[PDB]
């Protein structure tokens, strides 16, 4: 659960410092360690989307879901959007060093939004499940 | 019909140019000197007028607003007007040049706002020798070109808004 | 003579300031404009060899000639040696901005050593003839 795998491929993702607690507004860094051993190199790109996802239910559940989505969307933001990971040769690793900043106090357990897509078959693997940011 | 004599210009030189070629860095403005001589031995021109003229102003269909909404029309038309009237500017040009005289005049090329097809620049001048103070002036043309290149520089391809929600 | 052409091609070279005087030991720069108009982009590479060219004659000529090569070899250096000019597409110009510094005062009229070579047909076009450095 903490270490995530990619569908229709071999690559594996894990944040080195999975659990991190910091204060509001102080930029902090992660290390998205990568394992790639499938056949050939990749040019995957990681990005964070600060857009409110569309809801699909009673209002008591709809607004719960929307509060979750809104906090995910505009709680934490990435200082390295559209960071093309340069090359990952086969049977090798990479440290996609990311940088963040938070603006809304709370606990972003298994933070969504941070998704990485591969420019070989258009995957949308949710790599953000391995992070447990806590900004006060 | 037999007129009076008419003079000629030759574009003796340009200071910071080589074969009428040069580059900008897409935002930096520069200036240089144009040296022109009056080859005639008797006549003296009493009129000069400089019109800058450019590749994008050449290479548009003269009917281009048929299928276009106002919002997309306005931005192109504004940048076109700006590029026409301010991309190349003339400072302290001369008014009269005596026969067999060479004159240097300054020209300021600035492109803070031009699209990524401004590859070409066709400054054409028109100089006029005064008639015998009766009716008119005898004009002429001269259409020296320039091949100005544009290099990429800092560019913003996206943004967001993400409104704040609470003080820090 | 100040303008220099290339053999078996149409590329042209010129320095923006062919004549420059500067005190010895101050790093300066000369902007080498490279007008390409022939057919295709180039990958020409600039380099300066600080090597005494072997001499081929009486001693009066021989030592004059040796002193000439020695002065050429170890008078000036280029702080950006083995520069890879990135790309110069056809019908375009590039500014190969070079940085130099002198260590032996003199008049390096039509300085040799500096010769950009085309990495397309293995030419040795001597672009150094367009520079007339004078270091006090």
Curated annotation (Swiss-Prot), chains A, C:
Localization in the cell: Cytoplasm; Golgi apparatus, cis-Golgi network
Chain segments annotated as coiled-coil in the UniProt record: none
Quaternary structure and partners: Part of the multisubunit TRAPP (transport protein particle) II complex composed of BET3, BET5, TRS20, TRS23, TRS31, TRS33, TRS65, TRS120 and TRS130. Interacts directly with TRS120 and TRS130.
Function: Specific subunit of the TRAPP II complex, a highly conserved vesicle tethering complex that functions in the late Golgi as a guanine nucleotide exchanger (GEF) for the Golgi YPT1 GTPase. TRS65 plays a role in the YPT GEF activity of TRAPP II in concert with the two other TRAPP II-specific subunits TRS120 and TRS130. Involved in cell wall (1-->6)-beta-glucan synthesis.
Note: Present with 1660 molecules/cell in log phase SD medium.
Protein name per Swiss-Prot or TrEMBL: Trafficking protein particle complex II-specific subunit 65
Gene (UniProt): TRS65
Boundaries of the shown chain within the full protein: 400 to 560 of 560
Swiss-Prot record, chain B:
Signal peptide: none
Source organism superkingdom: Eukaryota
Subcellular location: Golgi apparatus, cis-Golgi network
Subunit and partners: Part of the multisubunit TRAPP (transport protein particle) II complex composed of BET3, BET5, TRS20, TRS23, TRS31, TRS33, TRS65, TRS120 and TRS130. Interacts directly with TRS65.
Note: Present with 259 molecules/cell in log phase SD medium.
Family of the protein in this entry: Belongs to the TRS120 family.
Name of the protein in question: Trafficking protein particle complex II-specific subunit 120
Organism name: Saccharomyces cerevisiae (strain ATCC 204508 / S288c)
Name of encoding gene: TRS120
Residues of the full protein shown: 842 to 1009 of 1289
């Amino acid at each position: 659960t903490s270490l995530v795998n990619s569908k229709l491929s071999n690559v594996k993702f894990k944040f080195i410092n999975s659990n991190i607690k910091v204060i509001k507004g102080e930029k902090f860094t992660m290390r998205l360690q990568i394992i790639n051993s499938s056949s050939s190199p990749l040019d995957l790109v990681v990005y964070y989307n600060n857009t409110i996802n569309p809801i699909p239910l009673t209002l008591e559940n709809q607004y719960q879901l929307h509060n979750k989505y809104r906090k995910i969307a505009e709680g934490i933001i990435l200082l390295s959007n559209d960071y093309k990971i340069p090359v990952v040769p086969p049977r090798e690793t990479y440290f996609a060093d990311l940088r963040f900043i938070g603006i809304m106090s709370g606990y972003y357990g298994t933070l969504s939004g941070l998704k990485v897509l591969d420019l070989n078959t258009n995957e949308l693997i949710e790599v953000g499940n391995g992070a447990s940011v806590l900004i006060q | 019909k037999i007129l009076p004599e008419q003079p000629q210009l030759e574009l003796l030189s340009t200071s910071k140019m080589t074969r009428n070629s040069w580059m900008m860095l897409d935002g930096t403005k520069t200036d240089f000197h144009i040296t022109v001589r009056n080859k005639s031995l008797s006549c003296a021109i009493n009129h000069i007028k400089i019109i800058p003229m450019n590749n994008i102003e050449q290479m548009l269909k003269p009917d281009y607003w048929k299928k276009m909404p106002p919002d997309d029309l306005y931005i192109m038309e504004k940048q076109l007007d700006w590029l026409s009237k301010s991309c190349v500017r003339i400072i302290k040009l001369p008014t009269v040049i005596k026969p067999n005289e060479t004159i240097t005049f300054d020209l300021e090329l600035d492109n803070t706002a031009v699209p990524f097809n401004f590859t070409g620049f066709d400054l054409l001048i028109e100089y006029g020798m005064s008639a015998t103070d009766e009716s008119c002036i005898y004009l002429k043309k001269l259409s020296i070109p320039y091949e100005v290149t544009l290099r990429r520089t800092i560019e913003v391809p996206s943004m967001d808004i993400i409104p704040l929600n609470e003080l820090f």
